[PDB]
Amino acid sequence: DLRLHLLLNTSVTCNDGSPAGYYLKESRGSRRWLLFLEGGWYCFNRENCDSRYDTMRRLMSSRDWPRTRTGTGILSSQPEENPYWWNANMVFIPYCSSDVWSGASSKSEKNEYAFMGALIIQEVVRELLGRGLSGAKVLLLAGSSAGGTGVLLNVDRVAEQLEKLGYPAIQVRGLADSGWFLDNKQYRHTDCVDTITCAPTEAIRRGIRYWNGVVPERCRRQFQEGEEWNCFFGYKVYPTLRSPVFVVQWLFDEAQLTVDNVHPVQEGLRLYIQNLGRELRHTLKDVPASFAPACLSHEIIIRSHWTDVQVKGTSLPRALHCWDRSLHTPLKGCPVHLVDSCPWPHCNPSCPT
Numbered sequence: 235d236l237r238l239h240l241l242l243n244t245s246v247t248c249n250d251g252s253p254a255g256y257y258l259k260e261s262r263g264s265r266r267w268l269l270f271l272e273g274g275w276y277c278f279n280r281e282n283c284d285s286r287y288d289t290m291r292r293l294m295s296s297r298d299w300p301r302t303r304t305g306t307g308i309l310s311s312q313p314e315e316n317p318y319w320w321n322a323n324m325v326f327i328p329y330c331s332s333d334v335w336s337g338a339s340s341k342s343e344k345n346e347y348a349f350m351g352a353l354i355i356q357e358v359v360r361e362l363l364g365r366g367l368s369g370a371k372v373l374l375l376a377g378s379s380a381g382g383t384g385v386l387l388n389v390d391r392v393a394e395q396l397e398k399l400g401y402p403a404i405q406v407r408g409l410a411d412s413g414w415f416l417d418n419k420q421y422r423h424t425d426c427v428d429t430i431t432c433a434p435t436e437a438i439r440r441g442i443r444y445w446n447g448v449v450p451e452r453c454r455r456q457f458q459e460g461e462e463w464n465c466f467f468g469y470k471v472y473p474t475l476r477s478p479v480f481v482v483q484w485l486f487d488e489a490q491l492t493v494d495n496v497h498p499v500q501e502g503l504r505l506y507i508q509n510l511g512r513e514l515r516h517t518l519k520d521v522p523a524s525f526a527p528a529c530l531s532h533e534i535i536i537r538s539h540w541t542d543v544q545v546k547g548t549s550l551p552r553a554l555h556c557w558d559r560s561l562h563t564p565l566k567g568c569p570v571h572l573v574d575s576c577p578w579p580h581c582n583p584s585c586p587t
C-alpha cells in the first residue's frame with residue numbers, strides 16, 4: 235500500500251485550510267518516479283463550493299483521509315496488473331483544491347476557501363527530493379480527468395523548478411488521461427446563470443478569477459490578459475509545451491458529453507456524436523504520443539483492468555513502454571501514436587463494458 239504524508243509546510247492547504255499531502259510507496263531499486271494527480275470536477279463560486287463541502291468533502295479537506303491507499307493500475311507494484319512501471323516509486327496526490335490544479339490563493343479575511351493546486355504540486359516535489367527523488371532519472375507527472383488537465387497546466391513548471399533547484403539530469407514528462415476537452419458547440423444550450431447552465435468556457439473564466447488561477451507561461455503570452463481560460467483546453471495548450479507529453483483520451487468521453495448536454499438515437503444526435511469523434515481525432519493528428527480509442531468511457535490509467543483495451547492490436551501499457559523506448563526514428567512493431575478511425579462508440583471491440 236501507499237502511506238499518507240501531510241505536507242510539512244502547513245501553509246500549503248486544501249480548500250478548508252487543512253494541510254494538503256501525498257501517498258508514497260518507495261521502491262529502492264528504482265530511479266523512476268510516478269506522481270499521479272487525482273481528478274474530480276471543480277467549483278467556481280461561494281455557493282457551489284459550499285455545496286461541494288457538504289457532500290464531496292474529501293475533495294476539499296484532509297481531515298478524513300485514510301492513512302493508506304492501495305495502488306491500482308499504473309500505480310500497482312505487481313507486474314501482472316502493471317506491465318509498464320511496476321517497479322517505480324509510486325505517489326498519489328489527492329485533489330483537495332477544486333481548481334483544476336491551477337490555483338495560487340490562500341484562505342484569508344477576504345477568501346472563504348484556499349485554492350492552492352499549483353502550489354501543492356510544487357511543495358510535493360520539494361519534500362520528495364529529500365526522500366529519494368534527488369536521485370531520479372525520470373519523473374512522470376500523470377493524472378486523470380481534472381488531474382489530466384492539471385498535467386498539461388503544470389508539467390513545464392515542474393521541469394523549471396527542478397532546473398532552478400540544480401537537478402538538470404531529472405527528465406520530466408507528462409501523461410494526461412481524459413483531460414483533453416473541446417470548447418465545442420453543445421447539443422442543447424442555455425445561458426450561464428448557475429452551475430448546471432454555465433458552459434465550460436464561461437465556468438473556467440469565472441473560476442480563474444475566483445482561484446487566482448495560473449497557466450503555463452508561453453500559452454499565457456499567446457492569449458494574454460482575460461483570455462487565460464483558453465489554456466485549459468488541450469489542443470490550445472499542448473503546442474506551447476516543451477516537456478514530452480503522452481495524451482490518453484476516449485473519443486466519446488462521458489464528461490465531454492455531459493458538458494455538451496448529451497444523455498434509440500435519431501439523425502440529429504447521430505450526426506452530433508459522429509462529428510465529435512471526428513473533431514477529437516483531428517486535434518490529435520499531430521500529437522506523436524497518444525492513445526485514443528473509439529469508446530464511451532471516462533478515465534483509465536488507475537483502473538485495474540486498464541490492460542484490456544487495444545488500438546490496432548496494441549494495449550496502453552505497451553504504447554507507454556514504446557514511448558519510453560522512443561525517448562532513449564520510429565520503432566518496428568512498437569507504436570506510440572494510436573488513434574481509432576471508426577466513427578461510433580464501441581466500434582472497437584476491446585472497449586470497457
Ligand SMILES: Cc1ccccc1OCC(=O)Nc1cccnc1
Nearest residue numbers: 274275380383415434466467489492
Ligand atoms: C470541460 C473542461 C475543460 C478544460 C479543463 C477542465 C474541464 O473540466 C474538467 C471536468 O472535470 N468537467 C466536468 C463537468 C461536469 C461533470 N464532470 C466533469
Ligand SMILES: *[C@@H]1O[C@H](CO)[C@@H](O)[C@H](O)[C@H]1NC(C)=O
Nearest residue numbers: 243244245246353354356357
Ligand atoms: C511554505 O510554502 C510557501 C508557498 O509555496 C513557500 O513560499 C514558503 O517558503 C514555504 N515555507 C518554508 C518555510 O519553506
